Design a protein around this ligand. Structure first.
Ligand SMILES: [Cu+2]
Ligand SMILES: [Cu+2]
Ligand SMILES: [Cu+2]
Ligand SMILES: [Cu+2]
Ligand SMILES: [Cu+2]
Ligand SMILES: [Cu+2]
Lengths: 334, 334, 334
């Protein structure tokens, strides 16, 4: 059908871990869904020590925002590279077919913009990332990645084909950073991107992240920015990792239904404690909360979680179920 | 139903890789299944060189013992921290719902004990581990982890819904250790836990294990402690890894039915050569032996297996099947 | 049935990434399928810098060639170790049952040969590799591994049981090398295998590959050796990794049907962006091309892909579909 005959809808994105408005079950026929993102090179402080890096972002955040469409919609993205940036950038959608996911068509120097359209022919959560030829892992591991969710037109389904409807959704982007270290182990900083590049390559070639964070920094999804839920709410957590495997775990909960490799035509795995999201993938986990209190949500390499940054929190409201768990004898002498 | 009306049964645990007595198919209604574990901080020699570490254990072993219940039983654990220990400990069950898996309710100083109860609402094999706030990966990577199996009340089923009944079960706990090294590469020892802690953190932050072992030491599941089976026996191998991914493989065999991420509501994967158990998970593999002789059971990063310790053996009794395999021409000149 | 009554067919192998002739659906009853491989120790240049290693190969290549049979055929392999080699070698088939996959029966010194037969009782793609007791990871990580495909007798099937027929097949072997480095970071070379062995062990124990390549070298599956396809062709890519996990991704495409852990009795995963092939496994991905142009095929740890070597290309012929993807506004000022 002629694409100029289709409805157009403009999305206004939100910063992760929040997700822009959308309907689970498609309330219209196929649409051209219009998005705009502005690339921002910016300094970011990523840890409690004050370590500051030169991040490369879509729309000012690490991760980039979650885009949401339905299967067989068209995604039309206007990608802007303002002249205040210094580098060449582009975008590759793992949801898309052809031209390196769009990367071959979206190369923008500072001061340029472009508009890409693709048909979202496969349902699932997918990574998107910058990928300039010859500099790909540098851009991705500088934070230049996010995700897109392509919902089935009739929403999510369980392993038996019955509906799964979330009440809340969050997007956790997990980022491995490779901050270059001197021989004593202290981070180096650099005066220009070119002067940094060889030691970024050197740091990356060790394959050992210095930091692994959610939402761009140690502690970002804690305190006043903890995720929230109520007992009995159905929550979908989309989780991406553009470059290394991760093993998400909700401490005190489960993934009731998990698409570990993120593709909704497949039945979910049930009752997961932990699951493996391969580097280069988005996964999604659905959970109905049953207990109030604090939860941690981690990469279950616990060194990565608690020493390198890959941990966030939920604060859950509601009543405690002593049938599901109780302290019979509280800690006491002997 | 009122929990005080339920039967109580006391389990007496056994040391891994053996598993305490149980019935695959539940012979009673739901029960409160009572367990006791005593925490033991102890020196352990982990390799053939004599490297000795200060391990932190549940019940004196690495891994902690396998607990076995059925779905919708209640697990009631008395956790004892004797005054001969020096540290604070607790326990998080990945099988449980709420309070950080129990960790928020089970904090015991030396000289204290506690009793936790939870409902085992989801069937599968699950990790349990110590997780004291601010010291989590140190305790887990000191050996303070084990697993619990929550059987379906009607036992295990194959991908078609027919029964799978094991004749024997073993529990392989796989442990990544991070023994601190000086600049020359030799292990350091320490005089107190506090004096060790920073270099343990430093060692962990390299993300590179020094040792990866089954049942607490290089070679533990070999020789007089090799696993055993007979041709035609059905064996379930439960395998856990609380902190890093592993890729188990039976050299000379297969996983006929594998729950790689350990959750029995899902159909197993058939005919696996190797499978991925993510860090923070227990998996289970069912195999019917068809050939006698020696088998190795490994993490199939073969460096991890054969240089770092992640290898055990089966000794299998019975008759050789030349239809399945034979040497047509034995090795000879030309 | 008496094996001497069965047909014999001799296969003539081809060098990867190509695959010898075969029929998807079995056109005969069960056969003894005869293969010959000659071990070759040889120098190989593995990167653009000219780094040369002493590789250990089956049939002169890294990976060894793909062998193809059907379920319940017998594989009969004549393995030759010419006297021009210096080491002991053998072979373990993950497809086989008993005697360490054949390794216990196939130990050949230089100047010896042997013939092994096994029944291919399970359908899937499987690793094969050398595994001499006490030297296993050295041989495997020197390149001495390949794969075997055991097709179902009625060919491949989708998640619904309908046929999947490929038009083309390729075999990508992915190799992690551990070239020993001095303290300055430069590669060492060695005068004999014995003089190399300790530092190979030392290099392996770091767990950090120096190189991760497809088809034996950086860039091997590019340029005049890029993989090829046409729009509308159905392609199966078999991918093995004998020692470390990998996360394959077709840049600009998908895995339409993926057996990530390689075993065809299981339904494939649909619509994958990226998938996890555990170390010690072969996986297979089926894709129907929809767009022409250049694709990259990578391990989606992009550092591993673009800095360490784990990247190849497809060149795809045919017409561009602007409905699936188009540049609406090409990159331009503002
Ligand atoms: Cu960029
Ligand atoms: Cu990508
Ligand atoms: Cu502890
Ligand atoms: Cu845990
Ligand atoms: Cu060899
Ligand atoms: Cu193997």
């Amino acid at each position: 059908v002629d694409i100029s005959t289709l409805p157009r809808v403009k999305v206004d994105l939100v910063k992760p871990p929040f997700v822009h408005a959308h309907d689970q079950v498609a309330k219209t026929g196929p649409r051209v869904v219009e998005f705009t993102m502005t690339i921002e090179e910016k300094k970011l402080v990523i840890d409690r020590e004050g370590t500051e890096i030169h991040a490369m972002t879509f729309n000012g955040s690490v991760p980039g925002p979650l885009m949401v469409v339905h299967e067989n919609d068209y995604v039309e993205l206007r990608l802007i590279n303002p002249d205040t940036n210094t580098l060449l950038h582009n975008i590759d959608f793992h949801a898309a077919t052809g031209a390196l996911g769009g990367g071959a068509l979206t190369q923008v120097n500072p001061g340029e913009e472009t508009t890409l359209r693709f048909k979202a022919t496969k349902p699932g959560v997918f990574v998107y990332h910058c990928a300039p030829e010859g500099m790909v892992p540098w851009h991705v591991t500088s934070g230049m990645n996010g995700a897109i969710m392509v919902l089935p037109r009739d929403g999510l389904k369980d392993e038996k084909g019955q509906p799964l409807t979330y009440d809340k959704i969050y997007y956790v982007g997990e980022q491995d950073f490779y901050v270059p270290k001197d021989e004593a182990g202290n981070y180096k900083k650099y005066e220009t991107p070119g002067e940094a590049y060889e030691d970024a390559v050197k740091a990356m070639r060790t394959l050992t992240p210095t930091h692994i964070v959610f939402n761009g920094a140690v502690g970002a999804l804690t305190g006043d920015h903890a995720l929230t839920a109520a007992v009995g709410e159905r929550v979908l957590v989309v989780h991406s990792q553009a470059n290394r495997d991760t093993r998400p775990h909700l401490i005190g909960g489960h993934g009731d239904y998990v698409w570990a490799t993120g593709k909704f035509r497949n039945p979910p795995d049930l009752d997961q404690e932990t699951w493996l999201i391969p580097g280069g993938t988005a996964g999604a986990a659905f959970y109905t909360f049953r207990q109030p209190g604090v939860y941690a949500y981690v990469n279950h390499n616990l060194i990565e979680a608690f020493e390198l940054g890959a941990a966030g929190h939920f604060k859950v409201t509601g009543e405690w179920n002593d049938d599901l768990m109780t302290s019979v004898v509280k800690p006491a002498s002997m």
